[PDB]
């Protein structure tokens, strides 16, 4: 027996979808297609009734994202078996609308996209996923090729915002009318209103997450709301476009010269930077077993729309149960991935003699410090400050003109070069659950590798904190000496400098990890950055800089003032 196996066929479907039961979806939907006069009645019928149940169930707080994707696995697997019958008997089945989704050119991270997409499919909307590093050309060409009502763009890094504005300007040059939805971690409501919208006659809507998205595609794609929604979006996008537009960013900029005279104050003659126990470039690798203990699960829960900090989240009266099951699954997969060695985290680390020179860091070939093998550039905050200094990462390395011997470190790690293969496999068998799982887990593994390696550097490779012994909780709170800023973050926005790290460490040749034109890393599950030992070194944002630094930086980088303005776009204190 089973009780639910004694219910109506289209009732067992609703049950299997909601509960995510896969075992009987095959030999249960084939029976429902017989009752129906055509293949599209099962999809448009019981198959969607259940998803409609998942939808309100979800909206009430009795169901969460992790479970929802599990329902999709049953649906998408029901369609898969029922697609040979549909096409071989025509009819494209009624849908709520079509959409072309893709990760901007140059970018590579797509976890958030995969989520937005799956959720939309759970609302019958049809989604065509072009993947990542997709050229604006194929994007607009695909949307036309298969008549799409909406185009969705994703972007993780700053350089993506440029390619986005590009897509909008092209949609205008080509006459597109359909709405443009821009989302991602790099996308904000202010940028969409101040830099994206105005370049397109059609609607342009920014949407935080994958839940309020189905709500936008709903009103924006309807008839009784479509018009009112755009007008509201426009007005608002103006009260903000003119909000930021003028009423000038109160916080008077400063001469790059004055900033430099306010550089971090420190008596270097009295201080002696720890000497690295080791110098050189080392190919590193850690097992999943060693890295699990360094994993910070909080961001992992965020990724699945489960609010709460680990481990307290496991006891939450609302999502604790589901967080537990999601946690158990992740660990189940790690056990397999580790035992089979199907996913292998790897990286490279390096320490070099170094000294500051202006706002940059010279890196020497050896301890004689006679030959400079490379330069780390870095930018300086260009804002008036009282009580504080105009920070520049270089400031934390001993000045060349101090005679003090200092150093600088670099690293590049990835959760595994197999991330993509693995994702594709699940992608094949229409398993969105662990397709997302494996990538989210590869990401945790990468960040875990960065925490582990930073510890090894502090305790061994660099060796200034050999006796240091912190708990994972203690590591996450960064209650240790030194920092590891990563190109792209606030204190070092210029993404191009990742080239410096890749040159010093010869990353690609050593690990396989790659770099794109937009300077995104591959695999997606990968991290890279620097290492500073100074006990006074901390994170901060370079924020908005002026024309003077853009030019000085241009000279130093050997780039046009034009090229550097594109790369520091989000940090420019003036207009483009
Ligand atoms: C841990 C984390 C990571 C992860 C894993 C999870 C992830 N990305 O989703 C990993 C380890 C891969 C990572 C690394 C890097 N990161 Co990171 N990361 C973070 C952090 C702390 C959390 C983001 C998170 O977990 N997102 C949750 C996921 C599920 O959400 P999401 O991607 O944003 O997607 C949601 C929505 O935005 C939406 N959406 C997504 N796409 C679309 C598309 C459409 C069309 C629509 C309608 C909606 C929509 O739907 C999603 C589900 O709700 C943030 C800070 C922050 N809070 O934003 C930075 C942040 C994204 N990282 C940043 C940077 C700099 C980097 C690195 C280059 C760092 C380095 N190592 O040098 C690399 C990129 C690696 C590469 N391959 O190129 C930046 C800045 C962007 C910039 N200036 O380029 C951020 C904002 C940090 C900051 N404060 O400056 N990242
Ligand atoms: N202002 C800043 N400038 C440069 N890098 C920064 C920064 N703020 C954060 N970072 C980088 O991002 C890291 C924090 S995010 C990584 C740890 C987090 N618990 C997780 O698992 O996702 C910092 O350690 C540093 O590597």
Swiss-Prot record:
Stated consequence of mutating residue 107 to E: Decreases activity by about 70%
Residues of the full protein shown: 651 to 1226 of 1227
Family: Belongs to the vitamin-B12 dependent methionine synthase family.
Mutagenesis / variant outcome for changing residue 109 to G: Loss of catalytic activity
Record lineage: Bacteria, Pseudomonadati, Pseudomonadota, Gammaproteobacteria, Enterobacterales
Domain of life according to the entry: Bacteria
Annotated AdoMet activation domain residues: 247-576
Signal sequence bounds: none
The gene coding this protein: metH
Binding-site positions, methylcob(III)alamin: 44, 106-110, 154, 158, 210
Protein name per UniProt: Methionine synthase
Entry function: Catalyzes the transfer of a methyl group from methyl-cobalamin to homocysteine, yielding enzyme-bound cob(I)alamin and methionine. Subsequently, remethylates the cofactor using methyltetrahydrofolate.
Free-text comment on this protein's domains from its UniProt entry: Modular enzyme with four functionally distinct domains. The isolated Hcy-binding domain catalyzes methyl transfer from free methylcobalamin to homocysteine. The Hcy-binding domain in association with the pterin-binding domain catalyzes the methylation of cob(I)alamin by methyltetrahydrofolate and the methylation of homocysteine. The B12-binding domain binds the cofactor. The AdoMet activation domain binds S-adenosyl-L-methionine. Under aerobic conditions cob(I)alamin can be converted to inactive cob(II)alamin.
Miscellaneous: L-homocysteine is bound via the zinc atom.
Binding site for S-adenosyl-L-methionine: 296, 484, 539-540
Domain annotation B12-binding: ranges: 96-231
Residues in B12-binding N-terminal domain copies: 1-94
Recorded consequence of changing residue 107 to N: Decreases activity by about 45%
């Amino acid at each position: 027996q089973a009780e639910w196996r004694s219910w109506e066929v289209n009732k067992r479907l609703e049950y299997s979808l909601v509960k995510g039961i896969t075992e009987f979806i095959e030999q249960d939907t084939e029976e429902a297609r017989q009752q129906a006069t055509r293949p599209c009645e099962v999809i448009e019928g019981p198959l969607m009734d259940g998803m409609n149940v998942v939808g309100d169930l979800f909206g009430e707080g009795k169901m969460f994202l992790p479970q929802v994707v599990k329902s999709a696995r049953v649906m998408k697997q029901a369609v898969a078996y029922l697609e040979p019958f549909i096409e071989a008997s025509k009819e494209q089945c009624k849908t709520n609308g079509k959409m072309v989704i893709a990760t901007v050119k140059g970018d590579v991270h797509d976890i958030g996209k995969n989520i937005v997409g799956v959720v939309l499919q759970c609302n019958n909307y049809e989604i065509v996923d072009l993947g990542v590093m997709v050229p604006a050309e194929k994007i607009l060409r695909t949307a036309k090729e298969v008549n799409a009502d909406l185009i969705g763009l994703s972007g993780l890094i700053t350089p993506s915002l440029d390619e986005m504005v590009n897509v909008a300007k092209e949609m205008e040059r080509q006459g597109f009318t359909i709405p443009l939805l821009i989302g991602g971690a790099t996308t904000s409501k202010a940028h969409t209103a101040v830099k994206i919208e105005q370049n397109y006659s059609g609607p342009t809507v920014y949407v935080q997450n994958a839940s309020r998205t189905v709500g936008v595609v709903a009103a924006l794609l309807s008839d009784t709301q479509r018009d009112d929604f755009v007008a509201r979006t426009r007005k608002e996008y103006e009260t903000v476009r003119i909000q930021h537009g003028r009423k000038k960013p109160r916080t008077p900029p400063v001469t790059l010269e004055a900033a430099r005279d306010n550089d971090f104050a420190f008596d270097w003659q009295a201080y002696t930077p720890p000497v690295a126990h080791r110098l050189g470039v080392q190919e590193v690798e850690a097992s999943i077993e060693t890295l699990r203990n360094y994993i910070d699960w909080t961001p992992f829960f965020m990724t699945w729309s489960l609010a709460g900090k680990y481990p307290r989240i496991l006891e939450d009266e609302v999502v604790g149960v589901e967080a537990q099951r999601l946690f158990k699954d992740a660990n189940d997969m790690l056990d397999k991935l580790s035992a089979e060695k199907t996913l292998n985290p790897r990286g490279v680390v390096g320490l070099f003699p170094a000294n500051r020179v202006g706002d940059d860091i010279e890196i020497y070939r050896d301890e004689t410090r006679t030959h400079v093998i490379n330069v780390s550039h870095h930018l300086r905050q260009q804002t008036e400050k009282t009580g504080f200094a105009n920070y520049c990462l270089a400031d934390f390395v001993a000045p060349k003109l101090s005679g003090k011997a200092d150093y600088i470190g670099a690293f590049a790690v990835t959760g595994g070069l197999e991330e993509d293969a693995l994702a594709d496999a699940f992608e094949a068998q229409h398993d969105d659950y662990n397709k997302i799982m494996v990538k989210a887990l590869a990401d945790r593994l990468a960040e875990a590798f960065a925490e582990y390696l930073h510890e090894r550097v502090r305790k061994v490779y660099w060796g200034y904190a050999p006796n240091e012994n912190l708990s994972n909780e203690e590591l996450i709170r960064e209650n240790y000496q030194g920092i590891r800023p990563a190109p792209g973050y606030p204190a070092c926005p210029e993404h191009t400098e990742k080239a410096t790290i890749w040159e010093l460490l010869e990353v690609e040749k050593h690990t396989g990890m790659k770099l794109t034109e937009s300077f995104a890393m591959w695999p997606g599950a990968s991290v890279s950055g620097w290492y500073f030992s100074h006990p006074d070194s901390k994170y901060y944002a370079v924020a908005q800089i002026q024309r003077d630094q853009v030019e000085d930086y241009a000279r130093r980088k050997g780039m046009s003032v034009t090229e550097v303005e594109r790369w520091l776009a989000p940090n420019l204190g003036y207009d483009a």
